[PDB]
Design a binder for these strands. Sequence first.
RNA 1: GAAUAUAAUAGUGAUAUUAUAUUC
RNA 2: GAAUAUAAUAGUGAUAUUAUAUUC
RNA 3: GAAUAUAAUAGUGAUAUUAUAUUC
RNA 4: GAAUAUAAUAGUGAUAUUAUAUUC
Lengths: 668, 669, 223, 221
Amino acid sequence: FKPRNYQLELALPAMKGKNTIICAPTGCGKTFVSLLICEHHLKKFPQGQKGKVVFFANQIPVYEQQKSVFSKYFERHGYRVTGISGATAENVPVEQIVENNDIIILTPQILVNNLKKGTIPSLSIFTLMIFDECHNTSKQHPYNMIMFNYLDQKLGGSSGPLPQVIGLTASVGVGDAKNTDEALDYICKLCASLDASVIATVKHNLEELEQVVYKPQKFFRKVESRISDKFKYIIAQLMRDTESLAKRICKDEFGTQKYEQWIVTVQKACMVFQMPDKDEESRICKALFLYTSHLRKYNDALIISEHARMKDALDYLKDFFSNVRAAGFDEIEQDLTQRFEEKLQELESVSRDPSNENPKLEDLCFILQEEYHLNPETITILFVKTRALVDALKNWIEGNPKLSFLKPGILTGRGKTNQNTGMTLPAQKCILDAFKASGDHNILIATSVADEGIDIAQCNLVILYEYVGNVIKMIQTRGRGRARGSKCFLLTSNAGVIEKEQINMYKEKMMNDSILRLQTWDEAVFREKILHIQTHEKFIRDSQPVPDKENKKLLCRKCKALACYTADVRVIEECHYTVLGDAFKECFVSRPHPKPKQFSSFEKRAKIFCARQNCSHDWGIHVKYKTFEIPVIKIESFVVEDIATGVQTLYSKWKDFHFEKIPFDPAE
Amino acid sequence: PFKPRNYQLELALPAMKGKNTIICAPTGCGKTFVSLLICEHHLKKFPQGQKGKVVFFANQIPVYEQQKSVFSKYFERHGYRVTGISGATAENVPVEQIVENNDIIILTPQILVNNLKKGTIPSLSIFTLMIFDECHNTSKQHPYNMIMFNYLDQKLGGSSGPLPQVIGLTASVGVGDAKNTDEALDYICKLCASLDASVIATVKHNLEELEQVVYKPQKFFRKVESRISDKFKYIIAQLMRDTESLAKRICKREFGTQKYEQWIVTVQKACMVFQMPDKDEESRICKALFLYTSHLRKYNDALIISEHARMKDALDYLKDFFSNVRAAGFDEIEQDLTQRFEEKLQELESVSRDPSNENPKLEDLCFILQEEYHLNPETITILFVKTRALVDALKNWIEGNPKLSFLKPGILTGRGKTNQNTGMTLPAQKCILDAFKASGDHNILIATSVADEGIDIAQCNLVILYEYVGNVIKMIQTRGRGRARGSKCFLLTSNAGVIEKEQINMYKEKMMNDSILRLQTWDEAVFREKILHIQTHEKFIRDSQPVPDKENKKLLCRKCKALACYTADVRVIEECHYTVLGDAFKECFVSRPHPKPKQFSSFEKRAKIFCARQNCSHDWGIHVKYKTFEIPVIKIESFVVEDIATGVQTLYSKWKDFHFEKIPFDPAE
Amino acid sequence: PFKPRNYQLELALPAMKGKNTIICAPTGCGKTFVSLLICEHHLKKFPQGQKGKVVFFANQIPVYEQQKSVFSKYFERHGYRVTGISGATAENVPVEQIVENNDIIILTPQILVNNLKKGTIPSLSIFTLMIFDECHNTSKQHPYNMIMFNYLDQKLGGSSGPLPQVIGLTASVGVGDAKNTDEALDYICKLCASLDASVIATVKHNLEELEQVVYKPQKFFRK
Amino acid sequence: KPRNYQLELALPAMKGKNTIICAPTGCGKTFVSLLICEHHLKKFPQGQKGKVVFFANQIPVYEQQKSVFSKYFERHGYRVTGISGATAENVPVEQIVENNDIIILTPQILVNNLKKGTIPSLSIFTLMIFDECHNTSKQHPYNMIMFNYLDQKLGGSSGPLPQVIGLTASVGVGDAKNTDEALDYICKLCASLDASVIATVKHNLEELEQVVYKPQKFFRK
RNA sequence: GAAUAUAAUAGUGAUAUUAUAUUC
RNA sequence: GAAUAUAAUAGUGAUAUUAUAUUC
RNA sequence: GAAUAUAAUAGUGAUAUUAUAUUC
RNA sequence: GAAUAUAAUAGUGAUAUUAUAUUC
Ligand SMILES: [Mg+2]
Ligand SMILES: [Mg+2]
Ligand SMILES: [Mg+2]
Ligand SMILES: [Zn+2]
Ligand SMILES: [Zn+2]
């Protein structure tokens, strides 16, 4: 490919050896910039010397794409291109792989793990590091850890050579800056995190860039909420029927986030309820658990109903009560299900009438109608907040006759690794490769994509349905509609959303201004300030509990049944936790895992659940670890109890559970 | 080395002359040393440049290991490489080479059967001497008889190549269902034919030497009466009638008998195939009837236990059952039944605690034990019962009885079913057996049954048969427990059929011995001719001896009528096992870690699998590791077979009776 | 991803059963997917404590890059490291370590010939599966035939240690300068001998499918 | 019924380290050997398997060990065999070694077969266990075996060598007069057996001293 | 720079020439 | 099984809850 | 998962049900 | 028949002599 002038311009600082953050609009072709930089870098070395490049991609699709492109491009020049990801990280000589290759495409976590281990003793082995989406170089992100190693070597007494650092992004961000000064502060701190001394932006070829990447016209749609409230009435006193039921077992604004927070707190507060009679403790705790769960589901249904059809909420509840059954018979579940089934008729009567419609859905329908009437070849992408809303709007589109021209597809994340939700990568690739002008799909409903990602079919219509984001996501989303005439519609019923998007635009202004101001500084002075920030951050980073050796009991959070003792618990690789003994084997049932993956030295085989009287509470998974077939449990599934005092404590994460952790040993 | 008793030499004499022989002698007279004698002579008879190859068959792991140890320690100093092969060490090993490079090999016969069938061992000609421990088992479709089918097929065929001498060790050749001497003689001739034996070796010239080493225990018959007052049975009967009324209310023979059990089993099976247009209701109803019939069965078992033991034993059986009904998730109907049992529970336990409502049989047993241990506190007792439930019950009764404080009861049972959390493991058996002695922890040993003689244990001067019915073979074998002088054996029962059956067995022993004496007077040539005649007949008969339904069938859960899978998904491994393909089946079942993880064939048990729909948890089969794969293995006895076209539902106990298009398992799929 | 057509499974079947096989099928019937099937089954057949190592032979840089890309994208998910060595990336690199630290290696045959000749690769036993694209070139002094000369020398010679399974891919085995059936059979048998092939796989049970996928063009003669 | 000090003595061996286990006579070396062998054999994945060889230099010890090992490992599905001078000749030794997981052996057998070539390498074994390893010195068969081992090790060969376990109650100190000479001697012994760890009872001395008591020695001049 | 393959034309053939393509 | 980021909601904040996405 | 034997109980028997035990 | 170890006794030692024990 022949380079566009702004690409040569953006690449020029990097090719001069400067640690650079390259900031240019999404879709301007950062890949060829990376190729230019890498080619020049590798070819610049004399005969007796050789360079080594490492490219960081934080997503498997980007990883494979870049691996393929770099492989095809640099093979003929004589440079060996390889790649390492989680799938191919185990039981391979990472050091030899890195050594015997010139360009290594890498998921940052691999490098973090191998740096921590010692297989890669130093970053001095590399001569060039390139961070895709370098704005992620912050906090406890893998990029930032790698750079912690880098800077610890730099500022330290280590005289070993460090690699040139290049970052790629479309937006460096400004954090929560309120003015240009704070913005410049933040950007300087990012440049410090990446040890960058130059911020590369297009200047002398803006006219060329603006004829390749066009900024889509944004529109703000503030509509009215549901004036009606009959469905909410029904579900509300259903909710205080359930709340009265829960209140009639022990002592002590629906459809909102505060209520969800509160009911989560209530469930977690009921989990620690104790009694002299442990069996009645079990019964009461299971009761409260069920009630709180139902309340939560009702609340979720209300939220769905406010953002979509009442039918969608009713089908959500229907699916929920459908999965309550086929799990087992519970007296209380039968009670609640009856209490719902008696009002189902009124609910569907209310969800059938056409006088019942969300003005938001009608406005969205109006927008789609107008746009597709003006242009039937329109390719739309519709962002929502939740997958429930994804399915809901898909069903709403496919149901509405006025949207007959639409061919709705779906685009969600991969969901939680140990649950039967989300969407697999090849499925994503399938729908995406179907989502084209002359394809099977016209409109694509989606939640959120990590940064820019792979280029999909160009969407001349983007719709943000109750969707807020930061300035980085705002700037990145523009890549969906690079063609001139592309439109974006922020549809919502909250002034908050609009105001925050406006705030984001102003933040973009602050960002560009701060960058342009920084680009005027003397590079030496900037390097001095960078060194200052780095030294300060290293001082802070190098800042300053006793394990309770008393035995503890692990009870089921749902039914308070004894799972095991902490004395039986062993820790693998300082992160995972397994149980020993034949006793624990009698305490759980298991189902084959819906997403069998080979993370670390583990291979997921099954999920494990509580066995006592069909409790079925998720305790963790069952895996193949080397030679052993062992269970691995999560602490957030159990209530900790002290033997002596009898205290009951909850922990969402193992690292917060400071007990005596005995290392797993094969010789036991 | 050792001092051979003269009768042992007499028994070994025909075998040392190279004649195919069935050695029949009292249990515990020292068959191991006879085996060592015959084997040693056989190996030492060969000249230079040629060697012999002995194989020793034992159909029990303990006897296998014992004989392996004895033969190794005895013979290898002589320069004969001794080895053995069992199921544990049979997989992924060159059996042909192992047999070839060893002089004495100890097998469980199924190994040789499988290797003969597979062709790895091309012929039995590789062996020069075959010894069958407990040779009386050489009948019907027993592995011994399979091996001998191979042997006789090669013999009666035009096949050349030499055949090994055949020795068979037993204490009783048996007489089958004989009524007189001639029938018994025909049976014994048939057994001799099955083993190609032309000689029956017994002790004759050294009887007085034998009768001072092995004494016959005196037998007594204890006929008692059943309990006269049984309010327990009345209450349980009322519960049964109520359960029957519920069962009849959902869909439209004295209690505590085997007939009612057969009936309720037939009824459960008949209810598993109840059809309705509404399938959810069909599921609910079938599950209902299954639960009802199950509870009726448990009540029946309880009545039987109460009949043979304490009321507390039956009540604890029921309590354990209803306890297992809990922790497995209550059904509405299970809740109803548990409530109905709970209301009567107080009255039941009240009647149970009443000392006046005691079983006369336990009183008489206690009397016998009391008298015998009074006369001799150092008494070593063994107590045989029919069921394991009765084992546990009687141990609890002994430990609970103040009158029998001098007893320290131990337990001995089988290894139970391979895929159930029951029975008793082999090292546990060993543990309890080595603790059973005079200077040990256990005074009396409560046991179910033991295949043949088995490993010799601590001699028992008291053997009690508590409602115990067996054949003449095991009757003669049981005498080996009390070989010492003055050993006593009681037969306690409340039904004359048992005592009469024992008398029948004794008469059968008389017929057996008399028939042996008669046969021993025959000329060996004539006997060999008759043997060849019977062999040829049986071989003709043996040599003399359906379309597969290609229609797709639904395999449904016998408890829920829930769709488990289709026969199209089913694949067959090694023509015996049956797995299921597809990720759809994976959501139909749950699993629990296997209680007895063993490695049969190329299969390694990891877990048992159960139905997943609405907490049914009906047993579907197991989950194993097979070579590279991790797959489920199902049993047809857990499912109903519905034809998709006709809708007709059918039941099959075994896969071999289910004649459908069985597609072989292929890794390339 | 896609889904295998029946005749592709039919063509792949002898290879998946471990037989040394020459797959002969019309151009464009989809040989890359057959290769992927064979490789996937082969690699997934090994137990835990073992692993396979496949080598693919393309004698053209475009085909080399294509197969490298496809195999990389395909097997990366399954946890098999895919690499390649062409003439441009063969010098001053540890060939033995590259072959050792990879499960699938796409290769120009001359690389393997030269590395066998130098001794950097002491034996073909390091591979468990060799695939020859356009296997009809395995004759005379072609690099394929050199590799197979090494193979056969290890086979027949006192040399032992396991030899890799051998797959060949073509649309036509050729008949050389044959004038009749017997001579053609002679030639084909000699090619099978050159490739140590015991099975020639063609489409038979799914001809209708293949014919619906691949049509024979009508030929006209213009004098 | 494992004792704690037995587990302590077996622990370094179970971690794959070449180990000389030094513990008083009669503390139960057989069970330690059984634990080591069992763990070692079970550690291998599906596609692999181990092969243990146990050296006893006397026929009674040979028979005893062969018996105990055969009785113990039969249930675990491991084929146990033995070869001595009484059954050494006219029998395929390599085939026996190949077709068994545990081979009880008098060292002269292995010396003879190694020198004769029927056993081409010690790589066939994954674990070697020398009973009374203090005899691994001078021109003793143990030392010849270990000479083969070390010749293969220090050689250019890349073939995998087996783990090495020595068993004894006393490593000896030779003619050492001071701690330095004794240290050198013991180090040399460890080098002869390629051992990097000497396992002794440290944390369970009470238990051991309750199982084995030191008799009182009187001098009668 | 070197190697390889196919085709046509010469030679009984080995092989040679050119064209074409591939590879290191 | 674990780790990470973003957003919303609580809190002065450390942080916490949920949602979303990512990675080993 | 499968195979085998014994006993009781139904059937003329094949066989079937349960119990018990054994083996691969 | 051969090989090996330990102890004592001679020799600076290699080693030798005897006793004892082991192995092929
Ligand atoms: Mg929701
Ligand atoms: Mg060409
Ligand atoms: Mg029996
Ligand atoms: Zn629970
Ligand atoms: Zn079921």
